[PDB]
Amino acid sequence: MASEFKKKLFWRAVVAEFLAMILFIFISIGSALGFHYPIKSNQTTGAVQDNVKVSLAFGLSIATLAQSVGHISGAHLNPAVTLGLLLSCQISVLRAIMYIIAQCVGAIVATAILSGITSSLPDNSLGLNALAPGVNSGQGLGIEIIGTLQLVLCVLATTDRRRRDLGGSGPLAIGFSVALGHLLAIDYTGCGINPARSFGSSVITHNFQDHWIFWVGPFIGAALAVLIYDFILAPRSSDLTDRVKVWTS
Amino acid sequence: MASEFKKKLFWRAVVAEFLAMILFIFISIGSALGFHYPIKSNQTTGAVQDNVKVSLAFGLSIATLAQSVGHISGAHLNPAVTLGLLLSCQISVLRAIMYIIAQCVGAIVATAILSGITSSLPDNSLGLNALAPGVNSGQGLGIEIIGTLQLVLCVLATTDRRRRDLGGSGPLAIGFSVALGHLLAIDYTGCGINPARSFGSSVITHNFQDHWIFWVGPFIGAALAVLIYDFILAPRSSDLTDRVKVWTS
Amino acid sequence: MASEFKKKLFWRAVVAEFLAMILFIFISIGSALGFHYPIKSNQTTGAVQDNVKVSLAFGLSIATLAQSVGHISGAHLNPAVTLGLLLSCQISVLRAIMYIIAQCVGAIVATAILSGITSSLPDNSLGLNALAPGVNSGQGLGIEIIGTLQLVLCVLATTDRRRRDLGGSGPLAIGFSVALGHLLAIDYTGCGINPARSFGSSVITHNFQDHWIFWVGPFIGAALAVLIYDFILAPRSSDLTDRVKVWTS
Amino acid sequence: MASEFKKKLFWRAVVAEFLAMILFIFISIGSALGFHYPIKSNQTTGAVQDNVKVSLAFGLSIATLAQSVGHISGAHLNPAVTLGLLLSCQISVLRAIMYIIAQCVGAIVATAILSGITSSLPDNSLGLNALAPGVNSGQGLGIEIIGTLQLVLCVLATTDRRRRDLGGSGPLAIGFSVALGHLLAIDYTGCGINPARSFGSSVITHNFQDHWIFWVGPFIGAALAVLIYDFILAPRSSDLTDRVKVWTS
Ligand SMILES: CCCCCCCCCO[C@@H]1O[C@H](CO)[C@@H](O)[C@H](O)[C@H]1O
Ligand SMILES: CCCCCCCCCO[C@@H]1O[C@H](CO)[C@@H](O)[C@H](O)[C@H]1O
Ligand SMILES: CCCCCCCCCO[C@@H]1O[C@H](CO)[C@@H](O)[C@H](O)[C@H]1O
Ligand SMILES: CCCCCCCCCO[C@@H]1O[C@H](CO)[C@@H](O)[C@H](O)[C@H]1O
Ligand SMILES: CCCCCCCCCO[C@@H]1O[C@H](CO)[C@@H](O)[C@H](O)[C@H]1O
Ligand SMILES: CCCCCCCCCO[C@@H]1O[C@H](CO)[C@@H](O)[C@H](O)[C@H]1O
Ligand SMILES: CCCCCCCCCO[C@@H]1O[C@H](CO)[C@@H](O)[C@H](O)[C@H]1O
Ligand SMILES: CCCCCCCCCO[C@@H]1O[C@H](CO)[C@@H](O)[C@H](O)[C@H]1O
Ligand SMILES: CCCCCCCCCO[C@@H]1O[C@H](CO)[C@@H](O)[C@H](O)[C@H]1O
Ligand SMILES: CCCCCCCCCO[C@@H]1O[C@H](CO)[C@@H](O)[C@H](O)[C@H]1O
Ligand SMILES: CCCCCCCCCO[C@@H]1O[C@H](CO)[C@@H](O)[C@H](O)[C@H]1O
Ligand SMILES: CCCCCCCCCO[C@@H]1O[C@H](CO)[C@@H](O)[C@H](O)[C@H]1O
Numbered sequence: 001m002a003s004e005f006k007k008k009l010f011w012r013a014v015v016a017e018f019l020a021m022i023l024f025i026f027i028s029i030g031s032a033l034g035f036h037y038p039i040k041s042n043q044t045t046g047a048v049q050d051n052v053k054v055s056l057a058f059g060l061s062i063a064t065l066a067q068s069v070g071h072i073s074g075a076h077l078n079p080a081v082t083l084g085l086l087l088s089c090q091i092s093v094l095r096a097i098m099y100i101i102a103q104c105v106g107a108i109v110a111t112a113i114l115s116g117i118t119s120s121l122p123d124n125s126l127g128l129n130a131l132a133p134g135v136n137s138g139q140g141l142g143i144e145i146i147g148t149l150q151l152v153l154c155v156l157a158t159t160d161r162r163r164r165d166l167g168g169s170g171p172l173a174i175g176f177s178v179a180l181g182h183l184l185a186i187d188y189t190g191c192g193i194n195p196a197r198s199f200g201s202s203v204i205t206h207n208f209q210d211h212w213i214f215w216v217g218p219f220i221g222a223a224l225a226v227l228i229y230d231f232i233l234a235p236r237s238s239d240l241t242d243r244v245k246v247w248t249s
Numbered sequence: 250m251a252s253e254f255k256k257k258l259f260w261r262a263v264v265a266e267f268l269a270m271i272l273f274i275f276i277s278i279g280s281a282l283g284f285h286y287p288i289k290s291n292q293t294t295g296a297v298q299d300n301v302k303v304s305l306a307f308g309l310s311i312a313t314l315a316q317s318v319g320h321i322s323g324a325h326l327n328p329a330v331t332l333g334l335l336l337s338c339q340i341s342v343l344r345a346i347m348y349i350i351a352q353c354v355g356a357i358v359a360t361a362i363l364s365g366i367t368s369s370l371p372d373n374s375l376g377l378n379a380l381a382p383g384v385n386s387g388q389g390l391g392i393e394i395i396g397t398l399q400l401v402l403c404v405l406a407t408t409d410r411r412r413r414d415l416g417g418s419g420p421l422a423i424g425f426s427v428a429l430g431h432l433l434a435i436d437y438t439g440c441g442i443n444p445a446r447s448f449g450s451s452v453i454t455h456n457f458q459d460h461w462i463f464w465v466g467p468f469i470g471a472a473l474a475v476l477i478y479d480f481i482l483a484p485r486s487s488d489l490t491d492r493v494k495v496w497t498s
Numbered sequence: 499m500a501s502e503f504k505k506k507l508f509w510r511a512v513v514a515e516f517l518a519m520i521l522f523i524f525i526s527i528g529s530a531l532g533f534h535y536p537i538k539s540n541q542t543t544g545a546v547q548d549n550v551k552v553s554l555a556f557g558l559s560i561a562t563l564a565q566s567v568g569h570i571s572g573a574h575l576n577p578a579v580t581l582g583l584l585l586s587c588q589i590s591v592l593r594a595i596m597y598i599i600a601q602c603v604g605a606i607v608a609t610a611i612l613s614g615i616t617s618s619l620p621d622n623s624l625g626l627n628a629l630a631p632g633v634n635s636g637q638g639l640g641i642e643i644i645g646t647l648q649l650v651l652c653v654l655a656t657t658d659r660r661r662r663d664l665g666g667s668g669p670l671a672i673g674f675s676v677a678l679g680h681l682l683a684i685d686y687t688g689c690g691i692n693p694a695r696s697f698g699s700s701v702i703t704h705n706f707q708d709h710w711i712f713w714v715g716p717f718i719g720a721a722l723a724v725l726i727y728d729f730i731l732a733p734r735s736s737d738l739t740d741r742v743k744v745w746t747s
Numbered sequence: 748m749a750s751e752f753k754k755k756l757f758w759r760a761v762v763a764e765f766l767a768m769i770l771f772i773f774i775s776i777g778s779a780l781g782f783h784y785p786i787k788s789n790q791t792t793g794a795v796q797d798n799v800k801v802s803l804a805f806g807l808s809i810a811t812l813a814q815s816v817g818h819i820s821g822a823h824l825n826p827a828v829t830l831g832l833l834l835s836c837q838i839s840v841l842r843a844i845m846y847i848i849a850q851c852v853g854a855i856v857a858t859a860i861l862s863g864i865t866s867s868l869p870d871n872s873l874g875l876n877a878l879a880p881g882v883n884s885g886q887g888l889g890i891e892i893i894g895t896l897q898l899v900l901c902v903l904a905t906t907d908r909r910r911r912d913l914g915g916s917g918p919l920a921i922g923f924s925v926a927l928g929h930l931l932a933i934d935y936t937g938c939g940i941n942p943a944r945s946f947g948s949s950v951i952t953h954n955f956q957d958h959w960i961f962w963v964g965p966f967i968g969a970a971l972a973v974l975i976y977d978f979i980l981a982p983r984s985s986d987l988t989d990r991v992k993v994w995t996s
Contacts, residue, residue: 016482034436039383060429068406134786157815168916169417180807187781233763265731283685288632309678317655418666514980532934537881558927566904667915
């Protein structure tokens, strides 16, 4: 349907999806750069990053944001999730598209507002996702794939709809999945599992080194997610030709 | 209405809001100062603050307190939240006012009971909020603004009332928002996102250096919250003139 | 009532309350002593205790145990909680009594099973609660009082019964209250807020130095809890003489 | 019943139970090895493992996985849990069996996919469970027994079915039980409380030193679990001969 305020609701989503991504990145990357703050106009040694601190920053950002606007847009805030839904035929490409853009832009916008907030920092990488020393790049992409997979998979089961056994908070569970991802990937690849988030940093930093692994890995994981839930473990009893109909509306 | 025990309930709130703030500050700042405790009448080096420990101390204090008296007063415990509700026209100024005072006083009272509990500590700052070395003050206030924003925004969506899709604990979600805030702001500004909490420490310590950023930043974030939820993402279909009516009762 | 299996249910509680305390202490103190394990028949320096690790160990033990047997006995596992209920006239002294004993014994039993598990440790204090260097003993008891207070208060509101606005898990909330307590008191007094738990260690270690503060402090906090919830913030509209009736059955 | 798609559902479980174990181990052991990553073709000192990071990695993996496929197979992902259910006569041996195999294999498969992901690591133990220096082996098995016990016990109470007082998320609670286990056992035995998980590492590493303690300990704890819940604290009013019937179907 493309009439009356069916226009409104839609744009409100895209917009909520756009504003929410700003808070997400600002808060999360904002938390990650916080350890570089022993600063006092000097330059002697440095502090050790806290992986729990960062993983919770990202995960709780999502739990909170999903709780704050999840009813308005579905609180995707991540192309790997959106793409996950799309292939599940639960969303329209018009949506996927407009959303993934609101996402990358919000990231780009947020990652760029931090540059000013934390300008006073040296080799300010702005939390750019980079293959860590010792991680066999490429084959080191099994990390992003599994990290995004488990996430998208959680999102599909949590919004399955045929279920009546869910208990507790959908947001919190999805958020903990997001923290679970970083508890796994922070060390290896700095954890991306979210194309728009990786993208936002690599642009405001013009560093796109291997940046491709942060799209192919999640988008793949999403693919494995939709394949495993929708066809192996929890299949719909309807035919493909009809699911596809969702592609338009 | 201003009759019968409509007086009682009201004062019970203010009071619960006042007592709850005491536990809040005592527990939280109480946790933050705990790392300074390697003490043994000596003075050699010192321990490194734990940001997860502190962020959870604050967040769980709220989750717990919101659970303990949230039904009695709404468990605001924070002018930025109260102010957030007020502008949303969900509360009366008589309330906002009496509450924000119960808040600052509880802080002031709590921050002052700790002085005795932890008197045996050196440069006892009593967890006073201070711009960290390297944070471009002022423009370093985007931290408090975002930190309080995301919080107040969560509180507005969580108590939206038109919703029937909330699942899990409202308290816990709000509490995690409060921990999310510190996971972001502890390093930069010591995290305030709560005027009364900052205020309580700066008074029992007579240090009001830049203390203004801890009111303008949250109160602003609250403003951005109410603007984004009430007018951009989740608008009420009623007119302003009628919402305003709430200003009195 | 004291007929039929009203005997059974009762004893099943006491017993569940007794068995659950064993797991509690074993797991929690078990976690706390774990950092002393760099051991290799040598004796060079030592590791720094993790306060989040310990606070979660205790809190999640409770969340889990309250979830596992909370329907059977109410999952008190703590004289300060039991005593809290008793004064609230929600339990019978026959219960309070039989329970507090199942508690101290379980502690005593558990604290004593660890002695063997961790015998290979040096100055094995078995997690005994001790006033930390720098904490003005006595006036340093405001810690246990606030720590137990906030806890018991959460338990009273969470089982209030007149409420229909609770959402999420009662166990988890109470558990997080228990973790909140340690995030506050670990540094100062090693955190007790639970007479039976302190007691269990001080007996298998014959160290009762100031051990009194771990009964007077919590039991007091409980008192402040029942006073604040039952008479100031959430009063019952019934008279005292009738509540007292509960003292017997 | 062994007709129609009663075959399908069954295999879908086994399979979901098999795929879910892969993500579990990959993510969790994946997180545990992450601290060994300061690597830069050098070899100077090393980082200190984070026990909260690891405990949450395991626990949230379960919370997430139980949420993702718990409706399909029950999300056991652990012989000690399965075995726990079996003895409770809530599952068929045909199930227990096919499941425990899907488990060990998934572990074996996962533990083997990491070998490649983290090949670039030195004495890559692949998170193999080993008795820590100072832990009186054997009598040091009280750890695995208690760790698995508390877990299985939580799973039995959480799926009790006669209950109508559960609140919140069953998955999250079980997940926190899994994190609780590691907060206790990581230091002592590297925490197993899950035969298939220990097994998976010891095979891809051909190190089976004491590996027996990781079966006898959990399987025992499970036994103590089913004994305590099903016969001491929460008994069914039916006779044994009829429960046994479940052994077949
Ligand atoms: C339904 C059948 C499911 C089978 C699942 C087993 C998949 C095994 C593939 O492992 C992959 O090996 C690559 C190197 O060859 C790595 O680069 C990659 O990161 C890793 O993931
Ligand atoms: C509707 C939002 C559209 C956002 C478009 C972003 C395009 C990419 C350029 O980003 C810019 O990067 C600069 C630093 O390099 C910042 O100083 C500047 O402020 C920021 O804008
Ligand atoms: C189905 C959705 C597909 C989305 C594809 C968008 C990928 C993002 C593009 O990254 C680009 O990579 C180039 C190197 O390859 C860089 O030179 C360029 O500056 C950078 O912007
Ligand atoms: C509906 C439109 C929403 C647009 C949101 C983008 C806002 C960009 C403003 O960034 C602000 O820049 C200041 C310096 O100029 C910083 O001091 C301040 O902390 C930072 O927040
Ligand atoms: C109904 C509660 C009213 C509280 C009013 C507080 C006013 C500010 C003064 O605080 C005082 O600071 C002293 C340390 O400087 C403490 O020694 C003293 O105990 C504390 O009271
Ligand atoms: C709409 C709500 C407005 C609340 C305004 C209260 C602000 C708190 C006042 O702080 C004051 O700042 C001064 C410096 O400017 C200090 O000299 C003074 O000692 C300190 O108390
Ligand atoms: C309804 C009125 C509530 C008033 C609450 C304020 C209580 C102030 C008491 O502080 C107490 O001061 C003692 C030293 O004098 C400390 O030893 C003790 O630990 C500390 O808690
Ligand atoms: C029904 C349970 C009753 C428990 C009574 C406990 C009384 C206190 C003595 O504890 C004992 O301490 C010894 C170490 O000092 C341990 O070696 C011994 O095993 C343990 O029993
Ligand atoms: C209303 C409930 C009251 C419970 C009271 C029980 C308190 C526990 C007793 O501790 C005792 O303290 C003595 C020193 O004072 C020690 O010498 C003795 O060995 C030790 O066992
Ligand atoms: C219903 C009655 C329940 C009684 C529970 C008390 C059990 C005491 C057994 O302790 C066990 O002692 C062994 C050494 O002898 C240790 O190797 C083992 O790890 C430890 O667990
Ligand atoms: C249906 C899944 C069946 C899995 C059977 C696993 C048998 C045990 C052998 O594991 C193998 O270990 C090698 C390293 O030693 C890996 O290089 C190889 O890839 C992996 O397969
Ligand atoms: C009721 C379920 C019983 C499951 C029993 C399976 C136990 C796993 C076998 O471990 C084996 O231990 C041997 C040493 O004893 C090793 O030599 C051998 O390589 C290793 O594979």
